[PDB]
Amino acid sequence: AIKVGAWGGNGGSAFDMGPAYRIISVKIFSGDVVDAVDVTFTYYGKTETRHFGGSGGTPHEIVLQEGEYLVGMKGEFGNYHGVVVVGKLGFSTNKKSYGPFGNTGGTPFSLPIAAGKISGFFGRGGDFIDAIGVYLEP
Amino acid sequence: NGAIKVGAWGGNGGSAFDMGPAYRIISVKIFSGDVVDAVDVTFTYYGKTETRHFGGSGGTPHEIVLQEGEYLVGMKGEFGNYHGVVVVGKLGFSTNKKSYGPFGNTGGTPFSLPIAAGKISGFFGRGGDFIDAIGVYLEP
Ligand SMILES: [Zn+2]
Numbered sequence: 001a002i003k004v005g006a007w008g009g010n011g012g013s014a015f016d017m018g019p020a021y022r023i024i025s026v027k028i029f030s031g032d033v034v035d036a037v038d039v040t041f042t043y044y045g046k047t048e049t050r051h052f053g054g055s056g057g058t059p060h061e062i063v064l065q066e067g068e069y070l071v072g073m074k075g076e077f078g079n080y081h082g083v084v085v086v087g088k089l090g091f092s093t094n095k096k097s098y099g100p101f102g103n104t105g106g107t108p109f110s111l112p113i114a115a116g117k118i119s120g121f122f123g124r125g126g127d128f129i130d131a132i133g134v135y136l137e138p
Numbered sequence: 139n140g141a142i143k144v145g146a147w148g149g150n151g152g153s154a155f156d157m158g159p160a161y162r163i164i165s166v167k168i169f170s171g172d173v174v175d176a177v178d179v180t181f182t183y184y185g186k187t188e189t190r191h192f193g194g195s196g197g198t199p200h201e202i203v204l205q206e207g208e209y210l211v212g213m214k215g216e217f218g219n220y221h222g223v224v225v226v227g228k229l230g231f232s233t234n235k236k237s238y239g240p241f242g243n244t245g246g247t248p249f250s251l252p253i254a255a256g257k258i259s260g261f262f263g264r265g266g267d268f269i270d271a272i273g274v275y276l277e278p
Contacts, residue, residue, distance in 0.1 A: 002142060002276055003254035109250055114273060115143035133254065136276065138140045
């Protein structure tokens with residue numbers, strides 16, 4: 001299985017949501033900085049939820065359809081009052097293109113998947129979403 | 139043909155190239171000056187061992203020799219406007235042993251691909267006078 005990343009800092013303890021059969025929705029909580037993310041997905045028969053990061057920020061739901069896939073991830077990670085975190089996080093599907101969300105510029109990164117799909121998340125979480133990473137599969 | 143391709147980072151100018159996946163990247167040669175001109179990639183395809191010639195002519199050659207059991211596990215660089223043309227201006231690779239580059243002297247909007255689990259098995263992207271964009275095939 002393929003993992004790229006993670007982009008960001010080192011704060012907090014790690015997470016590894018593992019590959020899903022299909023991502024159903026990603027909800028991104030952001031303010032100044034990207035606080036957190038919610039991923040709902042099917043998993044070997046079971047509809048399953050995980051939350052990544054801390055509380056608060058305004059949420060924005062990315063809802064994935066039948067044909068709709070996570071095909072790209074762009075964001076900027078910077079240093080926010082003493083802590084290196086995801087300042088802006090954005091996603092794109094084969095149908096639309098979301099965000100990015102968050103108001104703290106920094107060192108950017110883009111991950112455009114020309115062939116394949118994002119199907120997982122592994123990273124590090126704190127009071128804000130410290131660093132995010134992706135499981136890739138075709 | 140269950141391929142994972144991520145990229146390409148850079149411009150939109152210039153003709154496309156795609157070396158597919160390989161069985162074994164043998165050696166990569168980056169041609170660079172101010173910018174990244176080019177990349178020569180030698181690899182074993184199926185039976186035979188070709189080398190493909192992507193990018194331009196100029197700059198100095200840079201030869202990343204690979205040992206048996208050394209894999210490309212990371213690519214980073216920057217891309218920017220260089221004489222009215224957006225090309226990759228920096229580029230750097232890192233294997234499970236050593237970490238090569240960066241080559242080229244021009245800076246711009248940066249990119250990074252740290253591979254936590256997996257490896258680089260072939261390039262795609264766009265060429266011309268310099269390399270405008272470079273992409274990459276992934277496999278575990
Ligand atoms: Zn050549």
